[PDB]
Symmetry: D3
Subunit: 132 residues, 6 copies
């Protein structure tokens, strides 16, 4: 049944004016906002926690710098099968019909983060909304 | 030529969520044309049970009929090249973004739209909804 | 409070594929369909009844011929102040933001008819939906 | 330069009707930028009564506060040239198609969005919603 | 009442990815493209000619600079009452429902030029499309 | 991985008023116009060259006729992995989410051509934009 998932709207969505576009696509699939924060600039330690599984990758520091280059919005979304369905909505830059498929064309600057599992979800929600 | 007719139901959840034009617009933009259309403020359960007769022995059969009579429905006959299979692809499923259910639905039951899935289904569903054959 | 109004989607909306576009705009303003009929070709006497107040005008026969040149949809819409609000949504070809303002550019071929008063509404609903 | 900040509330009827992104998108497309934003699953009535204090003596005052706490709200500080008056025009009213209320709302109470109507209103409403001035 | 009119799509439209959005609003109102040129950077002479009437105004030089800061598209559009209609479609940054009304918020960067009279239309068409 | 690719917007897009819709989908994916020509009626030679690989197929002549039955736009687009990405955006009349997937239902009238390889892209760019 109901799941909650963590979504980040990335700084490129703000620069390109696609924040409502991305949010609108999740809204139209009937997912509801449980929690939301706007960060004019997200603290670097939060981004590094969020991406900690990536700490050894070559792209790690650069992606963090990107994630801190403009605003982000963190959202907890709720709905039936939210984790997997919001992941599919995110998609990838090769898959038309998805957010990244229609609107992104970059390895790094790809508009949206969504939790990919139950464990990452629980962990990511606790990073951005620790009051709970 | 390659011309076919198919049957589409707009389900009560579409009226509930104000998605009726969005769904029809998606079919319209693919160049399919309305041939007949009826608005049912509430559909006779008899008609629903016929429409879903192949499903009469499943657990979900009664809950679904219930939902199907819980608000309005629109039944539409559409026409165009390869209409049955193309409108079916448009309908898609709740897992495939880009399709109607993919973009707009999130439930096994409340899924906004029905399209005929074969030439045989279409003839039969059209007969159910537009008996004036 | 609640009113009902009569709407015709005209044959030019079918030819130009704007049926859902027009209907969508009324839907987004929170008006509900009470009754609807599709007419592959509307009987001429219905069109002539519908436009009877116009019977002496120079455009009368030509407009009827147009109205019979392709399909029409007649709809009874319900909502708060439906007559006047749907009229304003229809607008005219000079008023951006309205249906005719955004999508039409013709004296005759103007996509949509809406009832303009309580009396015309009651009368027009009885023409297209006489079962009541 | 001509830079201003304004306060916008997305009302509970927007969440109800799934119009939140549509409204925000209309402000986004006019090139206004979010400066601060908060999501309230339910807003303290105290905050609403302050926000609508100039209205405390009207018949509709209590019914409106009721509605304002009947579901979520988002409060947003927007920034851009002439932001107060331009976002106010975007909001418009239920009689003017082309504006947010014009296209999407049909009620005197449930009207989807509030925008500050003056420089004085904005400073005060921003203070209410984002007391961390 | 068939007319042709000249439209310029300004560099801010390319910057903000609003090109198709703007052209679509004109298309949806049933106007047709009669000719079109894409300029990666317009010759400054063309811009000075185009805004000649404004050569004495204080914003003239900055505006010319703006108009050469990115690509522009020059379009000749045709349709009934095209000059007046496309001008209304263009609108102003105050009134919603128009291109500028919905999408612009600046006295200089306002996305679209449209001819405002029969004379300026003849003139501007000859500036951008001299081959007639 | 910056590439240029050639896109043709076909006469059925003008007929159905889908020009901006199609161009917008490419724009929204962050591809840029590098050059563009509008042809009220393309020289048949250009069309024959363009579809040379198909000169032996049964649909060759009808297709050439179709391609000259109304306006076309030829566009050179640039961006990361542009040839492959715009091809996917183009898609096919079976799979929703693409231009053809959403908007076309014909084996001939399918709205958009996009180059399918590095070689055809060089070639087709030289056909429509010989000045390089
Ligand atoms: O080569 C890469 C791979 C990933 N990323 C960034 O790091 C994030 C997480 O990487 P992952 O491969 O898990 O992508 P995702 O799960 O978000 O699709 C991506 O979304 C990118 O923004 C990057 O900058 N370079
Ligand atoms: O577990 C289920 C499966 C089916 N349905 C309903 O019954 C219809 C027919 O079921 P089917 O599996 O054939 O789905 P469809 O072909 O419509 O995609 C569906 O559209 C649902 O509305 C349901 O309520 N519960
Ligand atoms: O000169 C005219 C005036 C009107 N009409 C048609 O007749 C309808 C009714 O005329 P009216 O002036 O009442 O326009 P409306 O009330 O629909 O705005 C219009 O919508 C047009 O389709 C026409 O063909 N020629
Ligand atoms: O008769 C009324 C008038 C006002 N309102 C509510 O109170 C708010 C403030 O009223 P106002 O007349 O100032 O409208 P606004 O400035 O918001 O357009 C409105 O947005 C409505 O939500 C109401 O419920 N009933
Ligand atoms: O104070 C001003 C007024 C005008 N303009 C620019 O000059 C153009 C022509 O000015 P005009 O007042 O004629 O505007 P328009 O007729 O295009 O609305 C405008 O579109 C703006 O881009 C400007 O830069 N500063
Ligand atoms: O049976 C056919 C197949 C192709 N075409 C046309 O010829 C073009 C090139 O054919 P191809 O199979 O290469 O299609 P594409 O690569 O563009 O998908 C298509 O876009 C169609 O417009 C046609 O008219 N009849
Ligand atoms: Mg990952
Ligand atoms: Mg089935
Ligand atoms: Mg009238
Ligand atoms: Mg007020
Ligand atoms: Mg001027
Ligand atoms: Mg090919």
């Amino acid at each position: 049944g109901l799941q909650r998932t963590l979504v980040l709207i990335k700084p490129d969505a703000f620069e390109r004016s696609l924040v409502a576009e991305i949010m609108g696509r999740i809204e139209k699939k009937n997912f509801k906002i449980v929690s939301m924060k706007f960060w004019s600039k997200a603290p670097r330690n939060l981004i590094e926690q969020h991406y900690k599984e990536h700490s050894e990758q070559s792209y790690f520091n650069d992606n963090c710098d990107f994630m801190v280059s403009g605003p982000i919005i963190s959202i907890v979304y709720e709905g039936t099968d939210a984790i997997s369905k919001i992941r599919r909505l995110q998609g990838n830059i090769l898959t038309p019909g998805t957010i990244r498929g229609d609107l992104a064309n970059d390895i790094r600057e790809n508009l949206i983060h969504a939790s990919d599992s139950e464990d990452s979800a629980v962990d990511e929600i606790s990073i951005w909304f620790p009051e709970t």
